[PDB]
Amino acid sequence: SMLNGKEFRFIGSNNYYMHYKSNRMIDSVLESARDMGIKVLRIWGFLDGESYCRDKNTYMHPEPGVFGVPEGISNAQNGFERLDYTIAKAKELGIKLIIVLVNNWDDFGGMNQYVRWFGGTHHDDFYRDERIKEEYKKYVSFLINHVNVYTGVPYREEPTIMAWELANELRCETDKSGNTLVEWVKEMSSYIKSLDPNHLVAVGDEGFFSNYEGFKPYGGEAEWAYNGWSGVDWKKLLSIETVDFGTFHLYPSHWGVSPENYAQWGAKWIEDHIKIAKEIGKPVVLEEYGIPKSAPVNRTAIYRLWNDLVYDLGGDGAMFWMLAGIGEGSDRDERGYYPDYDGFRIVNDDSPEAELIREYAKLFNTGEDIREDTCSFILPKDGMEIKKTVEVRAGVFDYSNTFEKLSVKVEDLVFENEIEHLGYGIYGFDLDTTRIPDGEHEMFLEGHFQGKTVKDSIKAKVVNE
Ligand SMILES: [Cl-]
Ligand code: NA
């Protein structure tokens, strides 16, 4: 007995405003997901604290024991009604939802809002004070037992909900043994299963490791993500019997990785998580990943690599942060979309990232594997001004298993002998740009495969003077 008892694979995304925006905005996100082949959307199922609820004119958990709009307030939205609408519309369109129950971070209140309600002084009191645990349990029970006003079906019985997730990006830096979070996750996941035996439960953490033999970061960067600093012991969490699948997130630019290493670091992070998920024997989902648009790299090429690895290595899902749709009011940009406030937004438009997502959705959804051999510059980014020595990075995407060698041409120079494989199909070398005159130049990438050449080119402006 299960509402989603078939291990399926998917491309997914995230959207955090599905519980407080208008029907038109919600419809736009879900229709965009359907049109793009995105089968699962990860959404927030929380709005904690009176100030956060006021800010969005939408009430879910403004005070302890208050689940909805408080007394005394007119013209307010109810976040459960907005979630009910989202679920009903997702159901109509065939989209499944992962509903996250609290935020590690302060956005929409988060753990610290609970700490403030109960007179605590530290974020990590959220995991330890029984009164806070009890209030989280009361909130989760209210949500699981809620009857959707549009469908008439309680959330406990709703197959459109794919999974409950305990906490977005939970961390417990005050206990680097990992034990505080193991105990909390065991307690809360067991509690959810006691109320709802029908749905998958997952943690929602970023996937940090805690000094596992043989697992170190690519390039020695972001050691904190591998050494237990955040209080997350991913392998111990995945071993909890009431946790059905593992989650991990990926943001090399937030975590101290250098741009020349974003692609490989993320690739190794993905492979390491799939390897450890296999060691435990449970499925895994890359449930958030992103590169900011302003980063000095080819984002689409990096996303292509990361999605290739999730698919080829047997991961169950890859979900980008984040999908948006049409905007309204102050949350509307010049093109009519919800704005790209963080540099990660993807919409159903004519971007290369959107086209990549559409392609990969078919691959995950039906195994439609028509990937074609490709090579792309990763650094520099097209149109960049460059000077002194540049660490050129290129990806080779070899689906036919016929790749032989890579070359790069700039003016009369042919780089091939010094191009080094850096792992995962990423190649690199140092280009001393003082060898070429200042000005605009085309850089040509040639992937030599058996029986064909595949190409990429970018323009760069050399500005040594
Ligand atoms: Cl934290
Ligand atoms: Na989101």
Side-chain angles (χ1 to χ4, degrees), residues 1 3 5-333 335-404 406-458 460 462-465:
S1 199
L3 267 337
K6 134 173 293 275
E7 185 167 352
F8 76 132
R9 307 184 76 193
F10 57 93
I11 292 299
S13 192
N14 291 265
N15 180 286
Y16 60 74
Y17 63 65
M18 303 305 287
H19 61 317
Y20 63 91
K21 291 297 198 182
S22 65
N23 291 3
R24 178 159 168 269
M25 286 181 71
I26 286 167
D27 287 357
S28 175
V29 172
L30 293 166
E31 293 163 3
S32 290
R34 177 214 47 205
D35 292 344
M36 294 175 84
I38 295 170
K39 288 287 185 182
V40 181
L41 192 66
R42 178 168 176 272
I43 68 174
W44 293 175
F46 48 82
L47 229 173
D48 295 304
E50 4 167 85
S51 68
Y52 294 94
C53 288
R54 173 180 168 80
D55 181 65
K56 301 311 191 290
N57 194 39
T58 303
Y59 291 80
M60 287 183 97
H61 195 196
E63 297 294 339
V66 178
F67 307 119
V69 181
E71 290 207 306
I73 298 179
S74 300
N75 304 116
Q77 297 188 148
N78 181 310
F80 300 96
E81 180 279 330
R82 296 283 75 209
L83 185 60
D84 284 346
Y85 183 83
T86 289
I87 290 164
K89 185 70 188 183
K91 197 166 186 178
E92 179 196 2
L93 296 178
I95 307 302
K96 288 195 182 283
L97 301 170
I98 293 175
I99 299 178
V100 189
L101 295 165
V102 71
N103 204 356
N104 189 70
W105 309 119
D106 292 356
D107 308 292
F108 306 99
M111 293 176 187
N112 276 327
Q113 178 66 72
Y114 280 79
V115 173
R116 293 192 303 270
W117 281 329
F118 293 97
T121 52
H122 299 113
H123 174 272
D124 294 349
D125 290 348
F126 174 83
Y127 307 114
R128 300 181 174 124
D129 183 334
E130 173 56 31
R131 294 172 298 199
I132 297 174
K133 293 194 298 179
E134 176 65 19
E135 184 62 26
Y136 175 86
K137 289 184 190 180
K138 288 180 187 171
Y139 179 71
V140 171
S141 178
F142 184 90
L143 192 57
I144 292 168
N145 279 285
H146 177 73
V147 176
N148 182 313
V149 300
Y150 296 105
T151 65
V153 177
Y155 282 9
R156 168 185 286 120
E157 302 297 339
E158 178 50 67
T160 294
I161 300 171
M162 181 178 89
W164 301 117
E165 276 185 356
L166 299 182
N168 178 51
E169 303 198 330
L170 85 180
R171 297 180 183 188
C172 188
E173 287 173 1
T174 60
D175 179 10
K176 304 186 194 305
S177 77
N179 293 333
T180 293
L181 289 186
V182 168
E183 293 161 3
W184 185 88
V185 171
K186 285 186 183 179
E187 177 169 351
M188 297 306 188
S189 64
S190 294
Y191 179 69
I192 290 170
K193 292 295 193 172
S194 81
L195 302 202
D196 180 351
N198 303 323
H199 282 111
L200 301 170
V201 174
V203 177
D205 68 293
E206 293 160 280
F208 305 124
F209 293 163
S210 191
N211 296 306
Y212 306 152
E213 191 189 348
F215 287 93
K216 295 292 181 175
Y218 185 89
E221 294 185 322
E223 295 278 357
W224 68 272
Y226 278 78
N227 71 12
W229 175 261
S230 302
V232 178
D233 185 331
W234 196 63
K235 195 166 46 157
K236 283 216 236 94
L237 297 179
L238 191 56
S239 296
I240 292 167
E241 292 185 2
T242 43
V243 168
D244 295 303
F245 62 93
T247 55
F248 69 117
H249 300 189
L250 175 51
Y251 293 94
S253 72
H254 290 172
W255 290 352
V257 183
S258 297
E260 68 264 27
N261 295 327
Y262 286 169
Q264 306 92 288
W265 195 103
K268 187 172 193 295
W269 186 238
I270 289 165
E271 184 155 354
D272 284 347
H273 281 79
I274 292 171
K275 279 174 179 180
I276 294 173
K278 195 174 75 177
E279 293 185 11
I280 301 308
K282 287 196 182 163
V284 60
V285 177
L286 172 60
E287 71 172 6
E288 294 189 21
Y289 66 88
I291 291 288
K293 191 181 187 49
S294 60
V297 303
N298 182 341
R299 176 160 78 169
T300 297
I302 295 173
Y303 287 4
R304 186 184 308 279
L305 174 62
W306 290 354
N307 279 278
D308 279 337
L309 289 167
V310 174
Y311 184 77
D312 291 338
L313 301 172
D316 275 6
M319 315 179 71
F320 60 98
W321 181 275
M322 57 166 285
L323 175 69
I326 196 170
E328 293 179 330
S330 50
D331 288 324
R332 185 185 180 282
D333 73 12
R335 285 203 296 160
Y337 291 109
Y338 185 81
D340 188 5
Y341 285 119
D342 57 7
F344 296 115
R345 188 197 70 183
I346 291 175
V347 297
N348 183 28
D349 64 0
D350 299 303
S351 65
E353 293 90 339
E355 192 46 46
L356 181 84
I357 291 307
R358 294 178 193 111
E359 171 185 9
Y360 276 76
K362 298 180 174 83
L363 176 70
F364 277 75
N365 286 345
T366 60
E368 185 178 328
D369 187 354
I370 59 159
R371 290 175 290 176
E372 282 286 330
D373 298 334
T374 294
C375 64
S376 307
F377 284 104
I378 300 180
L379 286 83
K381 191 176 187 185
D382 204 353
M384 188 178 297
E385 291 186 351
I386 58 175
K387 58 180 164 295
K388 290 196 157 187
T389 297
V390 168
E391 297 190 286
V392 176
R393 297 290 183 267
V396 172
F397 301 93
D398 180 13
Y399 307 108
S400 58
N401 301 313
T402 63
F403 176 68
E404 301 167 342
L406 191 66
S407 61
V408 169
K409 299 182 182 175
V410 189
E411 292 311 329
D412 57 323
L413 304 178
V414 179
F415 297 95
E416 185 165 333
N417 185 242
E418 64 269 82
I419 300 190
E420 300 304 347
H421 185 226
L422 309 177
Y424 317 99
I426 306 302
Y427 294 80
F429 69 103
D430 285 356
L431 173 64
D432 177 7
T433 68
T434 72
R435 303 166 71 183
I436 67 198
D438 270 16
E440 204 70 26
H441 299 288
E442 199 78 17
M443 300 177 64
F444 299 96
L445 186 64
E446 287 181 32
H448 306 270
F449 289 72
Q450 184 172 6
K452 66 177 177 198
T453 303
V454 307
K455 292 172 177 170
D456 193 32
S457 65
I458 59 172
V462 176
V463 291
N464 282 306
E465 309 129 34

